[PDB]
Design a protein around this ligand. Structure first.
Ligand SMILES: OC[C@H]1O[C@H](OC[C@H]2O[C@@H](O)[C@H](O)[C@@H](O)[C@@H]2O)[C@H](O)[C@@H](O)[C@@H]1O
Length: 572
């Protein structure tokens, strides 16, 4: 019952005294859903001195089921039967995502055990994704699995996957099926993700004083409790929105934290767990830092913050995990360390002015089983590095110039592309995406409106628009790996020109899908007056090179780029 943790400058783990094993319903407000299957421990490398590290668990629909309002009884099916929330078969197969985070600055051993005492398999049955980074894996005599994790300034963020635990997603091209159809993905029934995080840069832990910092108290977050100081600090503990906007208690998922303008910094301590969402109002540079968790698990699908947090989609008022609707100019969001869990909608949007950028690093998103759970906006000149995002919508939204995304690992469900550049005509240059590891996908359908592809551009979102020949998109995408039977490299509906668009070092080691659903096929249709200046090199599939003689639709590359673009693009 008492956990044995360690927290020094070498490594740091933590626990919660209100962990709850629960695979079916919401956890109690002050409890934290804990893995029903795995325990994780950490020791300095080779010292056999293991310390407990809490393993969190997230489940499709968060135990709430198909409900319209956050006050509805769990699993009461009040959501309209016609609404596809992005979840179908997943609960029946027991799909869930568990994870553990610790901090480190020296080589450690990470030990995994099954909590029922059984064997997880031998080390040869263990795969760690992304496969670009290999680990030494051994078996302890109690049947555990031990992973040597070397010190790394950028940390490590990886999925540990056991052969006998893998589920095979099958699709008939319209829905997932329990047998027959075609294989569209193979991934853990019981996912286990490890975040071996570097300690925060000194500057990203704010220096706190009584007048400087509102220190929160573990328990119900009632309205106004977050105060109006420069810093909102959640020390270790569990916190939960407990009221609606009018101040009525015992209601979960019925409000969010509308910060005062004074408050420019949210700090989540390692071992803080906050059921809520953050909307900033400041006009200075603003911050979300620290190794705690912000969870949307009490919110219903599409929870509408302008309409009592019910399940009615609004592009303007459905709840973001990180939000701003009040303008400013020359602002930068610094996001270093946080994990978000179980977002009900799009995860981040800062509105009001065009003047905004972000520095995002060591930033994680888990338990995003709902549709519309896109990654954060990639505002102009943003620098993103060392991220791990589970998504069931657009992962990397390249809508703005000058941005860099580096060392991103994406775990895709079944909706929209990895990189999204469409929905409207855009002028973009000076973007680099390097070291992109797509470790899972499980597309049900082959689609272009929501592109089932690595690099995609959706057609127009609103009607009555035309493609713009005086706009162009230019970027460099390099060192990409998609693992598993993968979707197409490109599905782009051209809404403007593409020029100097470099795609280099792209590998599909397990091959593209070649089934009758057709998801493996890249599609770039004709668009009169527009160029498709794609320069592709070092594209391999299944270990074999894609060249100018096997790129085509019915060959290896499956690249159905319209003949009208001939000469504008090259594969070498
Ligand atoms: O974020 C994009 C989109 O995702 C969800 O819809 C996906 C469905 O789009 C339909 O047009 C298509 O016919 C289906 O096959 C797709 O599953 C979500 O429902 C929607 O609100 C979002 O805009």
């Amino acid at each position: 019952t008492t956990a044995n943790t360690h927290c020094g400058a070498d490594f740091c783990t933590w626990w919660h005294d209100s962990g709850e094993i629960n695979t079916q319903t919401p956890v109690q407000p002050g409890n934290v859903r804990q893995s029903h299957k795995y325990s994780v421990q950490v020791s300095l490398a080779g010292t056999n001195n293991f310390h407990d590290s809490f393993v969190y668990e997230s489940i499709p629909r968060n135990g709430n089921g198909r409900i319209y309002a956050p006050t509805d009884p769990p699993n009461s099916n009040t959501l309209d039967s016609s609404v596809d929330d992005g979840i179908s078969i997943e609960p029946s197969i027991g799909l869930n995502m568990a994870w553990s985070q610790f901090e480190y600055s020296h080589d450690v051993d990470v030990k995994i055990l099954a909590t029922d005492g059984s064997s997880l398999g031998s080390p040869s049955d263990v795969v760690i994704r992304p496969v670009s980074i290999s680990y030494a894996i051994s078996q302890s005599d109690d049947g555990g699995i031990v992973i040597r994790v070397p010190a790394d300034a950028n940390g490590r963020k990886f999925s540990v996957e056991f052969k006998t635990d893998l589920y095979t997603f099958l699709s008939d091209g319209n829905e997932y099926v329990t047998s027959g159809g075609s294989v569209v993905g193979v991934e853990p029934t019981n996912a286990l993700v490890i975040f071996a995080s570097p300690f925060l840069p000194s500057g990203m832990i704010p220096h706190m004083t009584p007048d400087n910092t509102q220190t929160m108290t573990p328990g119900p977050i009632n309205n106004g409790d977050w105060g109006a100081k420069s810093i909102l600090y959640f020390p270790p503990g569990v916190y939960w929105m407990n009221q609606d906007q009018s101040g009525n208690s015992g209601k979960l998922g019925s409000n969010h934290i509308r910060l005062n303008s004074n408050t420019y910094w949210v700090y989540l301590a390692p071992g803080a767990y906050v059921k809520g969402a953050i909307e900033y109002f400041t006009k200075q540079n603003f911050y979300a830092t620290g190794h705690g968790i912000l969870s949307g698990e009490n919110y219903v699908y599409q929870a509408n913050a302008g309409d009592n947090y019910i399940a009615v989609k609004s592009d303007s008022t459905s709840l973001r995990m990180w939000w701003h609707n009040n303008l400013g100019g020359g602002q930068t969001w610094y996001c270093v360390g946080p994990t978000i869990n179980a977002p009900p909608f799009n995860t981040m949007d800062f509105n009001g002015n065009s003047g905004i950028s972000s520095q995002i690093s060591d930033y994680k998103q888990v338990g995003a089983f709902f549709f519309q759970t896109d990654g954060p906006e990639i505002y102009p000149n943003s620098v993103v590095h060392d991220v791990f995002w589970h998504v069931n919508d657009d992962a990397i939204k390249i809508y703005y110039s000058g941005a860099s995304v580096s060392r991103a690992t994406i775990w895709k469900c079944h909706n929209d592309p990895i990189i999204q550049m469409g929905w409207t005509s855009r002028d973009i240059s000076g973007v680099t995406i390097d070291t992109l590891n797509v470790i899972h996908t499980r597309y049900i359908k082959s689609e272009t409106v929501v592109p089932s592809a690595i690099i995609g551009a959706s057609p127009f979102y609103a009607s009555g628009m035309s493609p713009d020949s005086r706009k162009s998109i230019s970027m460099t995408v390099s060192n990409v790996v998609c693992e598993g039977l993968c979707p197409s490299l490109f599905r782009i509906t051209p809404l403007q020109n593409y020029k100097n668009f470099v795609v280099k070092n792209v590998a599909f080691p397990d091959g593209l899908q070649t089934n009758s659903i057709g998801t493996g096929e890249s599609i770039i249709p004709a668009a009169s007056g527009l160029t498709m200046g794609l320069a592709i090199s070092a594209w391999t599939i299944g270990g074999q090179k894609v060249t100018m003689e096997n790129f085509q639709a019915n060959s290896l590359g499956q690249f159905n780029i319209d003949g009208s673009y001939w000469g504008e693009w090259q594969i070498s």
